[PDB]
Amino acid sequence: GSSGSSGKKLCGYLSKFGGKGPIRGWKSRWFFYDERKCQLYYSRTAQDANPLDSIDLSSAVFDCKADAEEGIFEIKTPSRVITLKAATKQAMLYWLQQLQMKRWEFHNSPPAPSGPSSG
């Protein structure tokens, strides 16, 4: 079944592009997924327990920029399209794939509980 170590949450430092600010550019922001509301929360630093904002992945679509060669991606949501980039090209791949697991799963999850479980 399972072994090794527990607590393999999904977290990591990403760079947010110009958005909701006076100027444009990338900024080192701390991003971390939440297993409570199934949303992606991010703050200034890992010490800032208080998440600056959150993005519902349930209805979010991750995409790769034209210059992905460096490792850039974008999360398109029905609320606000965010633009985050990873360390390298192989970095984002991990986020895009993982991020999905959370969402994709919810979709796979079975219907209302208390099923028949007969036979």
Q: What is the C-alpha separation between 94 and 83, in angstroms, rounded?
A: 16
Tokens of 68: 């992905």
3-state helix, strand, coil in the chain (%, to 5): 20, 30, 50
C-beta neighbour count of 83 within 10 angstroms: 18
Structure-solving method: NMR
Task: Give just the sign of the alpha carbon dihedral 13, 48, 77, 109.
Answer: positive
Domains detected in the chain: 10-109 (2.30.29.30)
Q: Would you tell me how many other CB atoms lie within 10 Å of the CB of residue 98? A: 13
At a CB cut-off of 8 Å and minimum separation 6, what does 57 contact? Answer: 33, 38, 39, 40, 75, 99, 102, 103
Q: Say how many CA atoms lie within 13 Å of 43 toward its Cβ.
A: 10
Cβ 85 vs Cβ 70: under 8 Å: yes
Q: Are 99 and 62 in contact (CB under 8 A)?
A: yes
Distance separating alpha carbons of residues 75 and 49, to the nearest angstrom: 23
* Alpha helices (H) in the chain, listed in sequence order: 89-108
Give the CA radius of gyration of the chain.
Answer: 16
Residues contacting 113, CB < 8 A, separation 6+: none
Q: Are 46 and 53 in contact (CB under 8 A)?
A: no
